[PDB]
């Protein structure tokens, strides 16, 4: 099935701007039907910083109905955007093309002012 082979940790999930999430799953030590999520995210969102290099991602995945939540802190060897994003959503394997539908929040500073911006990303399996 499609919800299997997601679990292989072999695939790319590409959003509407060409940003890429590469997920890796490991069984949760304590939670039934749950996986720890690792992997990398390559940003391509228009007008944003920290594009084009891998950032580690972390979170958790519920295999019972294929729901996921994962986050990235925008700090690596290439660029630091002093920010973090969290995506939460679900895999839809019903169509011939699998889609991960997410809502996200981006926390960041503008001067000394903190803010949290909202958006939506849909990722298609390549």
């Amino acid at each position: 099935s499609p919800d299997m082979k997601l679990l292989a940790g072999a695939s790319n999930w590409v959003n509407q701007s060409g940003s890429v999430a590469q997920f890796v799953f490991t069984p949760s030590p304590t939670q039934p039907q749950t996986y720890e999520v690792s992997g990398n995210y390559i940003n391509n969102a228009q007008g944003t910083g920290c594009k084009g290099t891998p950032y580690p991602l972390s979170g958790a995945y519920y295999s019972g109905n294929q729901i996921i939540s994962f986050s990235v802190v925008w700090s690596n060897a290439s660029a630091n955007c002093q920010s973090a994003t969290g995506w939460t959503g679900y895999f839809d394997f019903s169509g011939s093309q699998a889609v991960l539908k997410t809502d996200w929040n981006l926390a960041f500073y503008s001067g000394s002012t903190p803010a949290i911006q909202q958006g939506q990303d849909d990722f298609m399996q390549s």
Partner: peptide
């Protein structure tokens, strides 16, 4: 070393 940007939205 990494480049530093004020935010993910603004250099």
């Amino acid at each position: 070393v990494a480049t530093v940007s004020e935010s993910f939205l603004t250099e």
